[PDB]
Amino acid sequence: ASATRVIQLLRNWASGRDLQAKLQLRYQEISKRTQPPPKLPVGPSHKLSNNYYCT
Amino acid sequence: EDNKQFFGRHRWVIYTTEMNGRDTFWDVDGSMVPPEWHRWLHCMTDDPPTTKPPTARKYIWTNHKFNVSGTPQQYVPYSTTRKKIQEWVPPSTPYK
Amino acid sequence: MWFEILPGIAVMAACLFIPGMATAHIHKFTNGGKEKRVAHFSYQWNLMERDRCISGVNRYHVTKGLENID
Amino acid sequence: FFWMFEEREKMFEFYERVSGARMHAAYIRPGGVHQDLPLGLLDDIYEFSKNFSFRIDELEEMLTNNRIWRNRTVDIGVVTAEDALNYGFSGVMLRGSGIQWDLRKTQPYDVYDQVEFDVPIGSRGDCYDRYLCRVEEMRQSLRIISQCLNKMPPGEIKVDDAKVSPPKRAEMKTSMESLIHHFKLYTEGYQVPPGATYTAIEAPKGEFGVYLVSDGSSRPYRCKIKAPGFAHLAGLDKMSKGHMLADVVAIIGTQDIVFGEVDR
Amino acid sequence: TYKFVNMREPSMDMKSVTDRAAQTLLWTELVRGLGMTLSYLFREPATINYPFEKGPLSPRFRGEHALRRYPSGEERCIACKLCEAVCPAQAITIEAEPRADGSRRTTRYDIDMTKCIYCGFCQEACPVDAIVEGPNFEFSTETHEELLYNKEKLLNNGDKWEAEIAANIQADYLYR
Amino acid sequence: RGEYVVAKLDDLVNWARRSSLWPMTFGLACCAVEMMHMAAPRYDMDRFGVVFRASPRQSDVMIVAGTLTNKMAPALRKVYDQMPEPRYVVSMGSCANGGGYYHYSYSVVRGCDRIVPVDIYVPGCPPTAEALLYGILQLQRKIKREKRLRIWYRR
Amino acid sequence: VLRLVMELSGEMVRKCDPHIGLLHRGTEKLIEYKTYLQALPYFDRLDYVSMMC
């Protein structure tokens, strides 16, 4: 779906930890969904010579 | 859209009060999202159709249709093939 | 977003609220503004009966002071 | 349930982003995975892995030291270490009792050998020890995730040999050999040399195996499924021999028996 | 390597026994969980407002099958029947024919959605990217016959979800 | 005339039914796990008045979640036959809708419809949680368009 | 899906008898009619909590 500091200190003390370091939420830190076109690499046997399938 | 919210509540839709006859004011489903905005809704992209004009072409529909199941505009399956072995037409001249 | 629960119990509070003053007010309403005279022992009942008899209106919570007597 | 199921949904998002469906990927095919990951997937995995331990321990604190979670579960239905392995038990069922055995280390398939990790080994062989083993397996899983995330090499996704894996779409539409190979691969498929194998891996339930015997054609001859839950349910009678009904339902929990693989 | 999970036996000094007796009598771990759940009560609720807001997806999402067509408007399907030979559930059926123009299009092309298992094998099998799976998942129907698609229904699906499929393919063809 | 009063009354009744349908879970395969994800925090079925947990005696809708085998069929039949009216049964997943991956099996019925009436056909393998939820919403709109007392008054 | 025909002197369970087959699909019969490439998704739908495993 951040909160008030009064509630922020209440949940942390009840949870006994500093949860603001990482919440179960996920804010703007996520990876962008419009990544540039990736140029994928090739495999080992991509040469045009000495690629005899027999060997 | 609100860029501050969580990734999944950062964008939303207020649906139309009316779409192709039906008055969808008080009740509405997720089927009146036109495809151009469908990708933007489901985070398939970060580009709204206003900023990202879909490539227009002749055969694309000019009016989105929600799921027409239930209403008499629903789809019914039917064989889309021609006829198999065809019957022999009897003659019309008399027996003699 | 705990405040969404706040309407939910609020009416609930009101739901438990009403039996509070309703019994409290009606007593005050019935007993001439005074609260109900609880009779937990027979002496209290005798006092209430003598008050009812002295009132002359068959209403115990009606009370008359020295102005009633000589 | 719900607290960790939100994270499970976050996993389903990755599943969707790699293969195309959030549950049934059809990703890992013979000759390597189907296609490469989308850009930015690694970063999101990194953030999730950072955030996960703070809720793994959170689940622990609710269950581990709780009085009634232990009392309902501690030392109910003991399984003897000797009697465990004869019963065909596997996975955490073995590790809960105390045998130091794990296919990820002893018989390392793929690159599991280069990955450093400890296994949780049980103490009393009871329900509670197995549950703790599952949680410590969560944490060691997070450590393994970090290790593989940091050291993924540059290379292709499928075996370069096109006769077993479909060619890339570029050479499909430009090269004769790729077109014919794809046509036959999706028409006939890679004919497998005749032979029988029993391949076993450390599935999270337990050791999961396939007895695949192929006659020597485009089709298999017989595949048999060793599911970790079958021998488990076979031994489930000896598993509970005097404990209450609430105990048998506490048993089928760390028995972790999904009825999709035992039943086949 | 391995780690023993539960061998941490307790000590027996006066302090440790007093602490354990207090924890057993004055319920503490009980209160620990009772306070953790409180922390989760005051947190931000994870909930997406359907259908106003939809779940995040990916360009590879596998959904309703559809038959695309070339920019000229001609359908891409040349009826090679590769997709029929690929579908593990055999949900695809084609009958081909030499058309009036000549191009070998399908007289019949039906996908049994109730037999389909939504794998994406057909699209990766297609050598002309004719059959594809659109991003739509909002086609829950009322009658079983409604699910059994036809060639015309597939063409209409490809003509409704078309900007979607074109944009997704443009963002995914490099991966595949 | 009577249509006004009877329509308002039955509109009230069908709204009450629509916003308080109680699923009878009934998960047979991976469709069960996807439904469980659909009741997870993210989509939160319980928000819409649906309660997911329901004994078959107190329930309104059955979700046939997964493949239905021959050995199962009598049990599902006895479960539905005991289900109090109204009882709308939704079939989720290609397997439950008809056949499935294991369409041509020997111990799997080729569709829940051959066993029990299906009110909403939900496709997917598995139907992604929100698709299930949309099927539930479609059933809700179906309950909205319910004219029981209208037909009684106009029989 | 599950069936436990249990025999119990009240509480301590004497002898259980699980009845698997309540979700029986002929997958092991189904494999040897499709190619391996077509046989893959069966395993995906086999243990549906550990798909990729």
Add this chain to the structure above:
Amino acid sequence: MFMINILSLIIPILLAVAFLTLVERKVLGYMQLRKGPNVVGPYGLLQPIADALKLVTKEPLRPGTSSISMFIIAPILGLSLALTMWVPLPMPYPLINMNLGVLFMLAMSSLAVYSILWSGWASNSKYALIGALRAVAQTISYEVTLAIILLSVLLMNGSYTLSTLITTQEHIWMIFTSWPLAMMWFISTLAETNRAPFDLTEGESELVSGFNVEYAAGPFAMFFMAEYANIIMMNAFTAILFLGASHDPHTPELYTINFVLKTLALTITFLWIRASYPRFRYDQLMHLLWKSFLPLTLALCMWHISLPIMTASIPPQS
């Protein structure tokens, strides 16, 4: 206007029970990261109305293998006792000043067994017949602890007049004197109302529901009404018994507000406990009270009867 006061007691308790079925589904969900019902009206305020209408117009199935007499009487007993057991509560001016109000209400608290047994047996199902005896044993075995706790607490109050209990507390919260006792009492309350940590009757693996299995629609909803009315009633009992409040006779509303706030807090603690804890096992369930709770309760009662004597602080009888 006496009957008007009665109705002003029943009806608001009915709305309170109705909206408890909403506040629980909201509190639980928020405790487990769920927004809860907020679609039926604003913030789900209208949701209890819809489910109530559905259950009223749901078909009530007659159990074919049953005698209808008890199938109808058991909801009557469970519901009517639950409501009439609200009668002697010290609102600032309690409705009925029964000289033995606490004993009156404790005696009526035992009557829920007399709905449980007929529901479990008359419906004539395995789950019903099991759960009837199991739940009966639960509630009867915790009623004793409730009894000694009530007696030991009252030994400092003065009498069984439940209106004077306020006069007992006045200065300090009574829990400050009997926090070891209340900690048991509250938990035993949790046991008597059959709540998730101590329910044991639902047990949705081997008992499913236990008593409300074959009950459908209306008679089924009546037992829920009894169950979620006992929640409020016993939380209110505990609230006055231990969490005292001020009461100025010239301003009755003050104690009313304080008391309803205490009741809401305690009910929220009920929901709080159920949303977190696992469920007991019958073995441990009766082990908890027979082995552990009862000896401590006996010793505490001995302590609390000896204490007023040695301190020369016996409470006033009248």
